Amino acid sequence: DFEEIPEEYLQ
Amino acid sequence: IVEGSDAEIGMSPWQVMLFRKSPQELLCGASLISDRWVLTAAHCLLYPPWDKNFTENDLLVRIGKHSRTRYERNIEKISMLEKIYIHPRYNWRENLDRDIALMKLKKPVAFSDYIHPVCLPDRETAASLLQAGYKGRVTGWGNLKETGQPSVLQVVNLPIVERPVCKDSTRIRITDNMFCAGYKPDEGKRGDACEGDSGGPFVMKSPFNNRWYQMGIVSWGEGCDRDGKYGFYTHVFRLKKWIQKVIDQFG
Amino acid sequence: EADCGLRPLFEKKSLEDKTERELLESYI
Ligand SMILES: *[C@@H]1O[C@H](CO)[C@@H](O)[C@H](O)[C@H]1NC(C)=O
Ligand SMILES: N=C(N)c1ccc(Cl)cc1
Ligand code: NA
Ligand code: NA
């Protein structure tokens, strides 16, 4: 449902 | 938000989205009160009846947003959480008394046209403005009806309700740390917060100094936009001494 | 903040949003 956010914020 | 409308760009630049990392989903609203502090409802973070007890690393905050689901490149800013603080007398067992929490960000967020803090009320602004019939504004990305979801941030203006009417609308025990807002059945107009709006702000624009103040936090309701029911909001001013104590000691 | 509650795209430009007047009119 949500657009993927940049991977930098999940690391 | 039920029976609201699309926000204008930059209309609520303090609005924050609490976002779950995995699975990626909206958890709650929240508000920006300084470059490093975000205010929300405690039940967005801790609600044992639903097995909810988030830790810092579970969550992100997204600031500057308009679209609910899009990654708003060059506009929104995504921040990690350094620390969660929940009111020590938050009553999740009974009635959500003192439904307030703070989140300290790992790094300060840069302000912009889209990102700007709301004021917290002083005693006098609270006394003047938190009167039955006076309207505030609620914003969020929650559901559009009780039983569905918005493209962009929604806004609704709602009147504060007399305390006896709030109390007589529910079997829940209401405390001085709560107020309620919404139209009465005979008033015709409608509107409410709904699932997913919790933790976001109830704001009022002071006619004395033309600044926006956060008077409430979306806390709880029985359904959404039901006739004879009202939304309940955390009374921010009544809990400001705790807010100040946290910020003074951990900021 | 000294600057809190003043929106860049509204108060700081002296532009009014579409419904803020509804709030003002309730403050009686
Ligand atoms: C919530 O979780 C933390 C650990 O993550 C724990 O210390 C705390 O007691 C929990 N609260 C409740 C009410 O279960
Ligand atoms: N049904 C709800 N989740 C709800 C929550 C909070 C308010 Cl103020 C109104 C409705
Ligand atoms: Na009652
Ligand atoms: Na209602």
Q: Which of the listed CATH numbers 2.40.10.10, 3.50.50.60, 3.10.20.440, 1.10.20.140 matches domain B13-117+238-250?
A: 2.40.10.10
Report the nearest atom of ligand 2 relative to the CA of B195.
Answer: 3
Could you give phi then psi for residue B115, rounded to 5 degrees? -135, 115
The pair of structure tokens assigned to B184 is: 């009465």
Report the nearest atom of ligand 1 relative to the CA of B55.
Answer: 5
Tell me the C-alpha distance between B162 and B181, whole Å: 9
Preferred mutation among C23, C24, C25, C28 to probe B, highest tally of B CBs within 10 A: C23
Is omega for the bond preceding B88 within 30 degrees of 0, making it cis?
Answer: no
Which residues contact residue B217 at a Cβ distance below 8 angstroms, ignoring those fewer than 6 apart?
B31, B39, B40, B41, B99, B100, B199, B200, B201, B202, B233, B234, B236
- Closest ligand by atom to B168 CA: 3
Residue B32 β-bridge partners:
B38
Tell me the C-alpha distance between B136 and B134, whole Å: 7
Domain of C10 in residue numbering reads as: 1-28
**Ligand 3 centre and the CA of B166: distance in Å?**
8
Give the Cα-Cα-Cα angle B155, B9, B237 (nearest 5 degrees).
50
Are the C-beta atoms of residues B206 and B121 closer than 8 Å to each other? Answer: no
- Ranges of each domain in chain B: 1-12+118-237, 13-117+238-250
Give B186-231 as a DSSP string: GG----B--TT-TT-EEEEE-TTT--EEEEEEEEE-SSSS-TT--E
Place of tokens 């001013």: B237
- The answer to whether the Cβ–Cβ distance between C9 and B13 falls below 8 Å is yes
Tell me the C-alpha distance between B222 and B141, whole Å: 18
Are the C-beta atoms of residues B217 and B236 closer than 8 Å to each other? Answer: yes
3-state secondary structure of B150: coil
- Amino acid B205 reads K
**Ligand 1 centre and the CA of C13: distance in Å?**
46
| Residue B206: exposure state from Cβ atoms within 10 A (0-12, 13-18, ≥19) | buried
The pair of structure tokens assigned to B176 is: 């001085």
Number of domains in chain C: 1
- Amino acid B50 reads W
Task: Identify the CA nearest to B230 among candidates B239, B238, B221.
Answer: B221
Are the C-beta atoms of residues B136 and B128 closer than 8 Å to each other? Answer: no
Where chain B is discontinuous (C–N > 2.5 Å), the residues before each break are: 147
> Which residues of A are less than 8 Å from B19 in CB distance?
5
CATH code for the domain of C6: 4.10.140.10
